Structures are given as C-alpha cells and as structure tokens.
C-alpha cells in the first residue's frame with residue numbers, strides 16, 4: 001500500500017541472515033531517530049477502536065516493551081501505524097546489561113532468545129526524551145490521541161523494589177498514560193521477581209499511592225499537571241511471567257482483585273522452551289511464535305480466575321490477524337507485537353490490522369470489543 005515499506009522489507013532478509021540481532025535493533029532505532037521510516041496515516045476502523053476502561057485506544061495493536069527501551073524512537077514507531085507503545089523496561093539508574101552477544105534469532109521457527117538484562121540509560125534521561133516527545137506531540141497531528149505507556153522495573157543490584165518504582169513514578173509519572181510493572185523478566189539473576197501474592201499486593205498499593213500523591217501536592221489544574229494524552233492520572237498494569245504454577249496464578253488473581261489493578265499484561269518470555277536447536281547453548285528467555293499458545297492459555301486462565309473483571313493485554317507470538325483474534329476470543333482487550341516486527345519489518349501493523357478487520361467481519365461480529373472472550 002506504500003512504496004516505502006517495501007525497501008526495508010527487501011533489506012530485511014539480508015539483515016536477518018547476516019547481521020547480529022542487536023545490531024539490527026540499533027540500526028532500526030537510528031533510522032527512526034532521524035525520521036526516515038515509513039508511515040501509515042490511514043484512518044482506522046471505528047469498529048476496531050478498543051478501550052481499557054477509560055483509556056481509549058484508536059486500534060488494538062501496540063509495540064511491546066523492550067523495543068524502544070530508551071524512548072529515542074517513539075514518534076517514528078508510532079507513525080508506522082500503532083495505537084500505542086510501551087517503552088522500557090526502564091530502571092532508575094542506567095545499566096549496560098549482560099555481556100554481548102545477547103540476542104539470537106532462529107528464522108525457521110520465527111523465534112528469538114534474549115539475555116539483555118535491562119540495558120537502558122536510566123530514568124532521568126528517558127524522562128527527558130519522553131518530555132521532548134510530548135512537546136513534539138503537541139505540534140504533530142500524526143501523534144494526536146496516541147498513547148505512551150512506560151514499563152518500569154528494578155536495577156539488578158537494588159535491595160528493595162518499591163524504592164526504584166517510586167523514584168520512576170516521581171520523575172516520569174506525570175508524562176505517562178499507563179505504567180507497566182515488570183515482575184516477569186527472565187534476565188535478572190533473582191529468578192524472575194517477587195510475583196508472590198504478599199509482595200505483589202504491597203508493590204501495587206505503593207505504586208497507586210505514589211500516583212495519587214503526585215496529584216495531591218500541586219496547585220495547577222489536572223490538565224496542566226498531566227502532560228500526557230489523557231490529561232488524567234496514569235493507569236496501572238502488571239506484566240506477568242509464563243513460568244508459574246496454578247496456585248501462584250490463582251493467588252495473584254486474588255491479589256489483583258483486592259488491589260483494584262487496572263490491567264494485567266500476560267505475559268513475558270519463558271525460559272522453559274528446550275526444542276530450539278540453535279538456542280540450546282544460549283541463555284535467556286525465548287520470544288515469538290513458540291510463546292503464542294502458552295500465552296493464550298494463560299489468558300484464558302486469568303480471565304477466568306479473575307471472573308472476567310480484570311482487562312487483559314496480550315503479548316506473545318502475535319504475528320497474524322488470526323493470532324490477535326485468538327487472544328481476543330481468549331479474553332484479551334489489546335495486543336502487543338515485537339518478534340513480528342523483527343521478521344516482517346515495516347509492514348507489521350498495516351498487515352495485521354487489515355487481516356483482523358477482514359476476519360472480524362467474517363465471523364459476524366459488529367465490533368471487536370464484543371469479541372473479548374467470545375469463544
């Protein structure tokens with residue numbers, strides 16, 4: 001539909017075959033930094049407009065965390081045709097992450113394994129970048145109504161987790177539309193994180209208190225306090241890992257209901273996949289198609305464990321419009337992509353939005369919001 005997407009798709013096969021994955025990522029980010037990526041300025045289907053409570057997404061596809069970990073590429077990625085982006089995961093202080101090489105691709109299974117280790121330049125710098133973005137958003141029509149969430153985590157060496165989360169809120173909170181709590185990374189030596197119910201409940205409540213406190217202590221109206229899209233206080237989501245037993249899943253669902261979390265992103269990568277030939281000697285968590293079915297099941301479980309009272313953000317192995325519908329019919333309200341962009345390139349959003357629209361009419365739905373859990 002656009003002559004510009006195609007050139008990047010041509011060079012994609014070469015890069016995927018010959019260039020280190022992280023080098024591919026750095027080059028992609030540099031291209032987007034200089035505003036020479038393609039665009040998708042078509043109007044979206046009003047019947048595919050989705051929402052998470054009062055958060056209104058123009059379409060149901062965003063970019064998952066870990067893509068623009070530092071918010072240096074926000075405009076260009078969004079203008080590819082996504083309704084929202086999740087930057088991060090960020091930590092208060094910068095971190096270089098694990099030793100390179102740390103990202104390896106298996107083209108045949110369209111899978112990736114990564115052991116990045118929360119490499120980022122730190123909250124202060126990323127906050128400055130998001131401020132620059134919000135100022136550009138005021139003057140750029142192609143960014144109006146677009147949503148930016150911030151994924152937050154902990155530095156590798158931090159003793160307590162709530163402290164790091166509170167600092168990020170107190171610096172970047174008034175510029176974020178939503179906050180994603182990452183307690184699911186496989187690349188922190190503390191195996192994943194304190195997803196135990198007691199710790200998680202206290203963590204969530206502390207975050208909500210810090211958000212509420214930014215509001216209280218100010219003289220300006222809410223319009224000028226929240227320099228975001230909504231002009232409203234940020235929502236709270238949680239990012240979950242797939243390597244959990246049923247008791248843990250049930251316990252966290254009970255905690256989410258008690259603490260009134262605004263959403264749950266299910267899920268992050270898994271370290272339990274052992275049938276990828278090229279990754280057998282590679283450390284890290286695996287992303288892509290091989291996580292699809294696993295994550296879909298997790299959606300069904302939590303959607304049921306939470307009595308359909310907690311909205312679901314789907315992440316894992318989404319490549320096609322059918323994949324998205326599987327997530328939606330399982331209980332998800334919105335979808336995030338990552339591996340798809342690695343293997344399909346610039347055309348990811350346009351293709352998947354068109355695919356889902358066609359499938360959505362075929363199955364007879366008036367709109368996709370009616371389809372959540374409809375199977």
Ligand SMILES: Cc1cc2nc3c(=O)[nH]c(=O)nc-3n(C[C@H](O)[C@H](O)[C@H](O)COP(=O)(O)O)c2cc1C
Pocket residue numbers: 064065066067069088089090103112113114116118151182239267268269286287288289291315316317318336337338339340
């Ligand atoms: C290189 C790499 C870095 C990632 N970094 C983060 C991160 O910083 N924070 C996070 O919550 N998830 C991170 N993820 C997980 C993705 O956001 C996503 O949940 C997962 O890769 C599944 O997406 P996919 O199957 O479409 O590839 C990362 C994944 C990869 C491959």
Ligand SMILES: CCn1cc(C2CC2)c2c(CN3CCC4(CCC4)CC3)n(C)nc2c1=O
Pocket residue numbers: 008009011012015016017020021022024025027028103105112341342343345
């Ligand atoms: C997981 C790290 N990561 C990241 C990427 C890119 C983020 C999108 C990878 C890519 C695709 N890039 C897209 C753009 C070009 C540069 C000109 C065309 C190709 C590289 N490929 C093939 N592998 C990637 C990877 O491993």
Ligand SMILES: O=c1cc(C(O)O)[nH]c(=O)[nH]1
Pocket residue numbers: 066089114115116117118119182184185186187268269285286
């Ligand atoms: O949640 C996460 C974090 C990372 C990382 O940045 O190392 N990698 C993943 O695969 N998942």
